[PDB]
Amino acid sequence: FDYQDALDEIRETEKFDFAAIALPEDGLHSAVIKWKYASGNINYRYRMIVLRPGKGLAGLVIRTGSRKIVEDVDAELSQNDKLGYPIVLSEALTAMVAIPLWKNNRVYGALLLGQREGRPLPEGSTTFRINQRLGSFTDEINK
Questions:
Q1: Could you tell me what percentage of the chain is helix, strand and coil, using 3-state DSSP and rounding each to the nearest 5?
Q2: Which residues form the GAF domain (predicted)?
């Protein structure tokens, strides 16, 4: 039972079209962020995504340490925003929730829960909890 299985459970049970985990990885210069795990992906372009520190949707969430909720991607994100969040374009997401993953007392990675084709975010998925559902990771709530 690895992160892939936990991700699949979350996506299926919460009724999302797409889910992914962004985690820190070693680069020859500095640490980078990659979407290490994906569930319900429509292609494999997410794998080519390599974010420098602070960059991308994962970077925003890691920086602020708080979740980002987008009910309507087409209407709520600017052109610059979409270009800055390549997984949003590669997976054709129309709605999403991105949640900071905490390890120890520090921000670490990001969980992305996404919808396609105009399907709304499930009700309450904004108050959604990581804790005891994705290994040792927790969310920003109670920090």
A1: 30, 30, 40
A2: 4-119
- Technique employed here was X-ray
Structure resolution, Å: 2.2
Sign of the torsion angle spanned by Cα atoms 85, 89, 95, 98: negative
The H helix count followed by the E strand count for the chain is 5, 5
d(CA 109, CA 102): 7
Contacts with 131 (C-beta within 8 Å, 6 or more apart), sequence order: 137, 138, 139, 141
Residue whose pair of structure tokens reads 């991105």 in the numeric block = 98
Go through 42-57 and write b for each residue having 16 or more CB atoms within 10 A of its CB, e for each that does not: eeeebeebebeeebbb
Query: What residues contact residue 56 under an 8 Å CB cut-off, 6+ apart?
Result: 22, 33, 49, 84, 85, 86, 87
Overall size of the chain counted in residues: 143
CB-neighbour burial class of residue 97 (10 A; exposed 0-12, middle 13-18, buried 19+) = buried
